[PDB]
DNA sequence: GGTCTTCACACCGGTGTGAAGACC
DNA sequence: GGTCTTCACACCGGTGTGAAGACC
């Protein structure tokens, strides 16, 4: 659970434990002795708790302490099962912490979207955790889908085939010259729900925790909307980084460039929304570095100049993230004609 | 020295030792106990040896072993001076190793440029280490300067004021909209020697080692050419990365974009040369990812499409790096009219 | 053609130093 | 206005997992 019950750890199966011993099964070119089972850790720590939608103590806790509970729970479990032999490298802890941050934020926004869709269909406004009720006029067509994308996803297969054909033609034109257009997959995409999914009830129900079935459900939601999204129905793109550095912060920027290059240039979309979430921006000057214009059209001067990234946000709690997502949905879904 | 003499370490002063004890002088928000004196390490290990221009054993040694000798020499010194108390974090070792790689490669190419300039002035062809003599017709005006740039250098102050005025006007036009054009400083720049420096003899003499005076000489060479370089006289840009990762490799690309944006767009330069040097590209697919077109003009189609980065090079030895730089100079300086 | 096995994606936290800073 | 002090730049090496792979 969230507080490391000893009995719960004892009742776990060997393959469900937060730490896997691989001292007799080494990795090819690695010296790792104990590995952090990321999905098992998520199921153990957040199997029945979702931040922002559980108790207030968990809703109002410093969100840096929420992201970090699985790692210390795993360390405690490893100390219990192995003694004087247990050790985990800090780099593995950093990798797992970043992945946990991404997945937990995605789940929180998934529950926010579920509540929004339930309100839009006219089933009411859930009130067990108290949030401001949106003032937008309800309409079934103002429904949103939150997709957490895989690591090596191309993100253009979500588009309708007619909009995919021009992108593929441009890519093949570059390919014929021996060139390419590589990029890293953005973390999360918030889009408008397609017409044929406007009545399905699985976009309206909240999840109780981050169990493995729920992990699979939230990790496979992108396949359902594949090839069904209009270019102009991509409402938000979010990149998550647990901490910032003066050199790493340039990775999302390139992303936010290439995406725009394929949306405002080859499809005529109004403007792409792209923001970065972080928990520790200290030691850098990212609040100024992100006030940077998009590298697109600057060499021509044929259009208005705007920024590559929408904003840098540091959520103090998960309730604040929920409130921000609700306000963004309320302010942006007005542009959709019901 | 290169092989860690004990007597040499004993004869060193306290402030010249490779490791500084800061257990009584902590850093503000850091728990570091022993810090790696990077410049002291460079002076100790390479104070009288420059790879590619010393003995063949050092010239033909695996260049991964050459970059790494200072770190192990420092570890040995720390074990000698402190016992059972000495420990250095791996992250500090990585940072220092990257900086050492950059500085050593810069020094090697500085000596190569010195030999090239000596040949161009007509003083002969040095032969103590045997390299192929360039076949280009000698001419004083085909001389090159190798500048190692600082960490936070803007790199546009090297340009002539007339070419700087348009860049500043473009930057101010973006600034008036609240936008900006930030980028990271490229590591090394090889440019054409200015006219008024065509006879000075400090661009023709090689350095015996990486002593602190020579470190200062090679670190301050950019100030001499500040405000004196034509936009079309920038011949090569080199970024150094000791190892590659699938996410980090995007940092130079953005660089290679922005530079081109300011040279082929606002100054009419023919094409910008920009390459990346690395020692370990395994675990990635960078040889394909760098076969990527520059993000400039793609939205207009008003010019030819080419790649942002010239090539990815993995030097097995320092002699190979010297030979590659000599061949590049021989092939490119022909375009300069003597 | 199932299963076992390897490999690329992207993940980030501890750093040395030049330069802006701050109070005398 | 010298000196002492803090802060942003950029530096990279150890990783869990989904998916391509390879030999039966
Ligand atoms: Ca991701
Ligand atoms: Ca993702
Ligand atoms: Ca991320
Ligand atoms: Ca550098
Ligand atoms: Ca440099
Ligand atoms: Ca570098």
Residue numbers in the entry:
A (entry chain A), B (entry chain B): 2 to 339
Show sentences the authors wrote:
Under basal conditions, SgrAI is a homodimeric and sequence-specific restriction endonuclease of 74 kDa with two active sites, one in each subunit. Each active site cleaves bound duplex DNA containing any one of 17 different 8 bp recognition sites.
First, we present the cryo-EM structure of filamentous SgrAI bound to intact primary site DNA and Ca2+ resolved to ∼2.5 Å within the catalytic center, which represents the trapped enzyme–DNA complex prior to the DNA cleavage reaction. For the rest of the work, we refer to the model derived from this sample as SgrAISP/FCA to indicate that this particular structure is filamentous and contains an intact SP, owing to the fact that the cleavage reaction was stalled through the use of Ca2+. A total of three Ca2+ ions are located in each active site of the SgrAI dimer in sites A, B, and D. The absence of the SP in the prior structure (i.e., SgrAIno−SP/FMG) captured Mg2+ binding at one of the two metal ion sites (site A), but no metal ion binding was seen in site B. In the current structure, utilizing Ca2+, we observe occupation of both expected metal ion–binding sites. In addition, a water molecule ligated to the site A Ca2+ is in the expected position of the nucleophile of the hydrolysis reaction catalyzed by SgrAI (dark blue sphere). The largest difference in stacking surface area of the DNA bases in the two structures is found at the second base step, between Ade2 and Cyt3 (i.e., CACCGGTG), which shows a >250% increase in stacking surface area of the ring atoms in the filamentous form (SgrAISP/FCA).
